[PDB]
Design a protein around this ligand. Structure first.
Ligand SMILES: [Mg+2]
Ligand SMILES: [Mg+2]
Ligand SMILES: [Mg+2]
Ligand SMILES: [Mg+2]
Ligand SMILES: [Mg+2]
Ligand SMILES: [Mg+2]
Ligand SMILES: [Mg+2]
Ligand SMILES: [Mg+2]
Ligand SMILES: [Mg+2]
Ligand SMILES: [Mg+2]
Ligand SMILES: [Mg+2]
Ligand SMILES: [Mg+2]
Ligand SMILES: [Mg+2]
Ligand SMILES: [Mg+2]
Ligand SMILES: [Mg+2]
Ligand SMILES: [Mg+2]
Ligand SMILES: [Mg+2]
Ligand SMILES: [Mg+2]
Ligand SMILES: [Mg+2]
Ligand SMILES: [Mg+2]
Ligand SMILES: [Mg+2]
Ligand SMILES: [Mg+2]
Ligand SMILES: [Mg+2]
Ligand SMILES: [Mg+2]
Ligand SMILES: [Mg+2]
Ligand SMILES: [Mg+2]
Ligand SMILES: [Mg+2]
Ligand SMILES: [Mg+2]
Ligand SMILES: [Mg+2]
Lengths: 177, 208, 132, 116, 328
RNA sequence: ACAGGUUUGG
RNA sequence: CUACUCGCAACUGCCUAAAACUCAAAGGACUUGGCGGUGCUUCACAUCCACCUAGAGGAGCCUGUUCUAUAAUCGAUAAACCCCGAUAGACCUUACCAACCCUUGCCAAUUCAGCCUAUAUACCGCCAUCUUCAGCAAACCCUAAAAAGGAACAAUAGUAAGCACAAUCAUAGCACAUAAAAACGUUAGGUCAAGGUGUAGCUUAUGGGUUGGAAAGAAAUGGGCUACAUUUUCUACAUAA
């Protein structure tokens, strides 16, 4: 994708290589923004349409206590929410993308619906994804089982530590007075 | 149409059940046919467990019956079998001891052998190609061949007889002619085979 | 297409009653008869003598209570006395309702040589069953 | 191989005369054309020839030669069985050819990207 | 409409009290069993649809229900797949796939350790267990279900079944199985009675095409039939009608072992024979064992013949024969 | 020109 | 791509090239229907063929039409008309005609009744057809703007009340089948003659009564009955004569 030239390090005989320095910097920023939302009691939705790790993503969301979405993304989910979900619902405060491109190799619908409903997005963008709309993009690989496991575990610990520190701060507040 | 898709065909053979232990492969399906709680249609009024009746005789009587008068066709078949048996007994008693060991008297056997002799082998199918119909020689199924063999004999005995000659009397001679392969049914079968051999060059038109 | 006693589908704003909302093939299935008597039985007679009096009353009550009658009449026939049940809107004053019921119970009884009962039920508006 | 396409169409950057005049834009569609009633050939022709040879030689009688009558019926039965079993085997498998009803679903999974 | 529901509950309670009072039964022992009958008696509405009749049940049964609360006071949804549209169906799919992966890894470990202690529980022929239907799944999961999703779920279930199941995995697979509604289509056998010093007594009933026949059979006398006081040979001159009577006896080899008396009303020359055949077959079950009764009901002796004459249609001749439709 | 009306199933 | 000019080996020509007058439009692309005597694919479980049964076209009779013939109804008159209105014509029916009678002439009354007078191309009430085809659709959401469209199940922006379908109901027990139902619309389809009707026409008449006739077949045709036989006909008879 044309918007990956500043996020690529080079090309080794056709295959492009991502610059891990900027990868790690963007990952630090993304993990910080993810931990703060979980600390401030923010609804985190892992939206990722990819029929290879749909089970792993749902298990990670279950272990984190945050919500997941790896099935067919419905049209008026985030826009026509007061008709699809219920009378009055609470939209996800943060959207996390583990696979930006769906099975049709096109940008997902949630990556545009978040920007259309003013919702922050933290997404793993491959060399063929469009990070023009993602708030905190991270140039990496979403096709490798070890890569997706690493990202799932990083978000797992970032949510766990945030929730545990929130509980500790509330415990300290209870003794404050 | 009153029988739904869950209704299967009945099984009238008594010997099929009178030996359930003598085999295991047949037991494997019979132990589940009822355990699946499968509904079975009612036994037909024309078919029973009698050892003297035959499905071939039933089919021939059904093809001979006009309208719905069943007893008329039944009596016609009875008279036909009786005439065949009596003519064969006359030929047996008018023959010598050498021909007694060759002339048969079983009406069922004579009838079945006549049907097997009149049974065709290959038929003709009209196929539309280039705006014209070509008679392609086509192998026919067993049911098709038997149906044609029965229908030819029935039609001949219906139309090619005299008003004074009765249907049982005419069929008693037609069966004896078909047993020896000298009758008009065998003639029609051979004409069909000749017309199929003359068109075998068009066999490349069939697609099945 | 069948049209007998069948109101067609509008854009979706017309109010229809429980009676008109059912096609004629629902009689004795979901909706009952508006008239009850003995003339429509098997070994009974006087089928037309009651039918003409039924139609005459259908027209008479419609002309007597104009605009305030909501649904059709209920005409019961029981032991020489006939009952007329009506669902009327409360548009007219009670004095004008009593004047008309007293006029009807004395006119129809003498016109048909049989006792008549007239029962009125006041509804605030037409009860809508389907979409409105 | 695929014929060359550079310098064929009429574009602003092409200095010569356009060679190819496409009726419709040369864009690979996401669905193939449906096969116009894929047909098949007959069977047991060689078995029928040797069967009718008996009729032509022995003056049209089946009691003379019999194996040419039984092998014909065996070929007919085998063709009748293969017409029913393969009609499901070849539609379940995909070793050889395949109907367009599956080619369309295969192409829609990985369609062409005209935009972006 | 919570206030409306509460008001309807109060109205139903007071109306039930007054109904018990006006009926004269004890209000404490007055329940729906009496409510239904009292309503049906007090409002004799004779209709072809029971749902159109007057009915007074609890408001929780009258007014329908809907989905429960998904998110608490804080707004956070309870389930972890609430943003998927089907928080129940997709959760079920996820749990099924997880159990499938667990069973796969367990079987792989067993194959690596060279242990095959499982069996194939997919062949459900003698049990007659079928999978769920769309209605049977939508009655469990409150929300709607699509046909493609139902087919995917059924195919995942059959995938899981095609592999060696575990201890609780068998119950997990079978909890979405529905067997025959009664699984006991075997008929009941009438006990052998003894009326007025008569042993081996049995009675049967048959019907085919508006012909009702009752048979009284004694398994102690010789083999003969008494049809309406006259002999069966004189009552049924046609061979077919006598074969209809011989058919149930020849299958059981009870030709000269039962004396029967039959009385038939309605039908013609073949309907009466069929009715007597059905009655005899249903009556002879008391003299034979269970396996022969099963063989008879598989042969069609104990099954009625629903083929009756169809009503004639307007504009036709014999409910199928149409008139000569001229094209021009 | 601070512009508006006027083509067409639109 | 016209006349008037200039130039041209061109002489029915070529290049240049107006004006009078007429109109407020003339034009390109697009979205949706309708249409196509341009195409491709799909199946019909009485349906097209491969195939089965019984029928019409051969004879007579009944009955309904198109025609000639009269003073002597009419409508329908391709699928969806032709034993159709009519499940019913010596008078009445009967709205047709010829001879004769009456004109506030059914009602309490009405410078009022009454018309089977025309308009089914003004209607309602009632239906035929696709049609056991399923689609219609208020309220939201989306489109690099939106006339409008909204679908890929290994799923790409679709949710949805209710009306259709379905279920249910009836053929006195299930299932099946049948019955029943089949929205929105096309055929300016049929019905002013079941009935009322807007418009346009009658009032000593296109209104109201009495009597008599409403033929007939040169000819064609639709649908049924009898048969043209031996599985037939007659006799008593449930079917062995
Ligand atoms: Mg990738
Ligand atoms: Mg072009
Ligand atoms: Mg194209
Ligand atoms: Mg224009
Ligand atoms: Mg020119
Ligand atoms: Mg010029
Ligand atoms: Mg046909
Ligand atoms: Mg006939
Ligand atoms: Mg004729
Ligand atoms: Mg005629
Ligand atoms: Mg006429
Ligand atoms: Mg006309
Ligand atoms: Mg007309
Ligand atoms: Mg007719
Ligand atoms: Mg007359
Ligand atoms: Mg007269
Ligand atoms: Mg007149
Ligand atoms: Mg019309
Ligand atoms: Mg639908
Ligand atoms: Mg739209
Ligand atoms: Mg809706
Ligand atoms: Mg229905
Ligand atoms: Mg029922
Ligand atoms: Mg059904
Ligand atoms: Mg119908
Ligand atoms: Mg018209
Ligand atoms: Mg027409
Ligand atoms: Mg008229
Ligand atoms: Mg009128």
């Amino acid at each position: 994708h044309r918007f990956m030239e500043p996020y690529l390090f080079g090309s080794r005989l056709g295959q492009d290589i991502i610059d891990l320095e900027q990868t790690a910097a963007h990952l630090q920023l993304a993990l910080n923004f993810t931990a703060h939302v979980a600390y401030r009691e923010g609804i985190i939705l892992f939206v990722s349409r990819h029929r290879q790790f749909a089970h792993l993503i749902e298990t990670t969301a279950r272990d984190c206590g945050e919500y997941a979405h790896t099935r067919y993304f419905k049209g008026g989910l985030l826009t026509n929410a007061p008709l699809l979900l219920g009378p009055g619902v609470r939209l996800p405060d943060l959207i996390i993308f583990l696979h930006t491109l769906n099975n049709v190799f096109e940008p997902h619908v949630a990556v545009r619906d978040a920007a259309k409903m003013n919702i922050p997005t933290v997404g793993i963008v491959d060399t063929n994804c469009n990070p023009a709309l993602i708030t905190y993009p991270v140039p990496g690989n979403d096709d490798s089982p070890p890569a997706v496991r690493l990202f799932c575990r990083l978000f797992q610990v970032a949510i766990s530590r945030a929730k545990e520190k929130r509980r500790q701060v509330e415990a300290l507040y209870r003794l404050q007075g | 149409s009153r029988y739904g898709p869950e209704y299967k065909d009945p099984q009238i053979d008594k010997e099929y059940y009178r030996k359930p232990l003598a085999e295991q492969t047949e037991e494997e399906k019979y132990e589940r046919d009822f355990k699946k709680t499968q509904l079975i249609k009612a036994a037909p009024a024309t078919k029973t467990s009698s050892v003297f009746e035959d499905p071939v005789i039933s089919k021939f009587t059904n093809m001979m019956m006009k309208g719905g008068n069943k007893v008329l066709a039944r009596s016609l078949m009875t008279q036909t079998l009786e005439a065949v048996k009596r003519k064969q007994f006359a030929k047996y008693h008018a023959a010598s001891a050498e021909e007694q060991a060759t002339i048969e008297r079983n009406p069922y056997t004579i009838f079945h052998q006549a049907l097997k002799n009149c049974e065709p082998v290959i038929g003709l199918v009209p196929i539309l190609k280039g705006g014209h119909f070509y008679q392609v020689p086509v192998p026919l199924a067993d049911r098709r061949r038997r149906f044609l063999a029965m229908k030819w004999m029935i039609a001949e005995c219906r139309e090619k007889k005299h008003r004074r000659v009765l249907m049982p009397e005419k069929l008693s001679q037609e069966l004896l002619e078909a047993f020896h392969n000298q009758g008009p049914v065998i003639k029609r079968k051979h004409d069909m085979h000749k017309m199929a051999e003359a068109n075998r060059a068009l066999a490349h038109y069939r697609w099945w | 297409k069948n049209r007998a006693a069948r109101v067609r589908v509008s854009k979706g704003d017309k109010p229809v009653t429980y009676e008109e909302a059912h096609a004629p093939h629902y009689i004795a299935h979901r909706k009952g008869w508006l008239s009850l008597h003995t003339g429509n039985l098997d070994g009974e007679d006087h089928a037309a003598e009651r039918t003409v009096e039924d139609v005459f009353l259908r027209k008479f009550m419609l002309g007597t209570f104009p605009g305030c009658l909501a649904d059709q009449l209920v005409l019961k026939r029981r032991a020489n006395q006939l009952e007329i049940c009506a669902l009327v809107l409360r548009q007219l004053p009670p004095h004008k309702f009593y004047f008309l019921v007293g006029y009807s119970e004395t006119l129809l009884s003498h016109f048909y040589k049989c006792p008549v009962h007239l029962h009125l039920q006041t509804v605030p508006s037409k009860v809508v069953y389907k979409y409105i | 191989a695929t014929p060359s396409l550079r310098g064929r169409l009429a574009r602003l950057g092409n200095p010569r005369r356009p060679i190819l005049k496409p009726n419709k834009p040369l864009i690979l569609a996401n669905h193939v054309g449906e096969r116009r009633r894929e047909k098949g050939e007959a069977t047991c022709i060689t078995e029928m020839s040797v069967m009718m040879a008996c009729w032509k030689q022995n003056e049209f009688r089946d009691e003379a030669c019999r194996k040419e009558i039984q092998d014909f019926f065996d070929c007919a039965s085998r063709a009748e069985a293969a017409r029913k079993m393969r009609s499901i085997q070849e539609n379940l498998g995909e070793l050889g050819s395949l109907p367009p009803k599956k080619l369309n679903k295969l192409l829609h999974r990985f369609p062409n990207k005209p935009h972006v | 409409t919570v206030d409306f529901i509460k008001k309807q509950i109060e109205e139903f309670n007071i109306g039930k009290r007054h109904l018990a009072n006006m009926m004269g039964e004890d209000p404490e022992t007055f329940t729906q069993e009496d409510i239904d009958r009292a309503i049906a008696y007090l409002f004799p509405s004779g209709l072809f649809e029971k749902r159109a009749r007057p009915i007074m049940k609890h408001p929780e049964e009258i007014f329908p229900k809907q989905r429960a609360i998904q998110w608490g006071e804080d707004g956070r949804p309870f389930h972890f797949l609430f943003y998927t549209g089907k928080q129940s169906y997709y959760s079920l799919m996820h749990d099924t796939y997880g159990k499938l992966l667990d069973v796969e890894k367990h079987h792989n470990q067993l194959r690596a350790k060279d242990l095959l202690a499982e069996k194939t529980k997919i062949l459900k022929d003698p049990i007659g267990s079928r999978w769920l239907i769309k209605e049977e799944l939508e009655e469990m999961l409150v929300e709607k279900l699509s046909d493609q999703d139902y087919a995917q779920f059924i195919r995942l279930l059959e995938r899981l079944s095609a592999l060696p199941c575990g201890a609780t995995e068998e119950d997990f697979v079978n909890r979405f199985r529905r067997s025959i509604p009664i699984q006991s289509k075997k008929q009941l056998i009438e006990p052998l009675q003894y009326d007025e010093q008569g042993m081996a007594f049995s009675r049967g009933e048959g019907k085919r095409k508006t012909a009702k026949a009752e048979v009284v059979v004694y398994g102690q006398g010789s083999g003969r039939i008494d049809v309406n006081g006259v002999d069966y040979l004189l009552y049924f001159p046609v061979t077919q009608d006598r074969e209809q009577l011989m058919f149930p006896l020849h299958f059981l080899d009870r030709l000269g072992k039962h004396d029967m008396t039959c009385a038939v009303s309605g039908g013609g020359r073949s309907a009466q024979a069929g009715a007597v055949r059905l009655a005899m077959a249903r009556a002879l079950c008391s003299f034979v064992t269970e396996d022969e009764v099963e063989w008879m009901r598989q042969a069609g002796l104990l099954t009625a013949d629903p083929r009756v004459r169809e009503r004639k249609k307007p504009g036709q001749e014999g409910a199928r024969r149409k008139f000569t439709w001229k094209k021009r």
